[PDB]
Amino acid sequence: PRFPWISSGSFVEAIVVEGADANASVTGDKNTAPMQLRLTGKVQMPNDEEFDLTGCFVTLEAWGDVSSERAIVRSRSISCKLGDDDIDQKIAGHVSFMGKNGIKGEVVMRNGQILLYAGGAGFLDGIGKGIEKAKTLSDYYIKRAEQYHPVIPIGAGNEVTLVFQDGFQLETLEEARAKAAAR
């Protein structure tokens, strides 16, 4: 089949081509932000052997978590045209940066001006109540500051390593149509 079996746990060095801002909130797993990277190595296989799969696109998804300032990435699919054929398989892999799981960045929040105004209003309200011997503005500003959620920005052009959690057999589009013609 001119295509080896990509065993479970093989990894390949890559490089990010499309960054994203990781939606890092209590609900980020459902609001994913697509990234993309492109293979620039040789697939390292368990017994010190490889398979030349370079210059190909694999599309991803992203969502960060705040505790560890990392961006968790779940791969989507692959795309390769080595020769006169096409490739489109689904990959259930992930991406690791500098040894650990998920690419890491610096979490970012924007509620500076709104929070400043809300705090100023609250302080003025407290002293105004105290020194007698506004109030309905503060609740509006809180609800306006509560609709953000911290994000982790990931550039485009950093080095990562994709790793295939579950193994699969690489096949081209035509070999996929032919077996689909059987049943």
């Binding site: 610096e106 929040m109 500076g112 550039g155």
Partner: protein, 38 residues
């Protein structure tokens, strides 16, 4: 007070809001593609 974690994106690259009509953007796209092909 202020926010918590750093409140700044570290590469500021915003869009330019100039008021040009659809047809002008179309002509600019023709100019760009024509130059790029050459």
């Amino acid at each position: 007070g202020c926010a918590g974690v750093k409140s700044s994106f570290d590469c500021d690259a915003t869009t330019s809001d100039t008021c040009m009509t659809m047809t002008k953007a179309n002509q600019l796209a023709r100019d760009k593609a024509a130059k790029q092909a050459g």
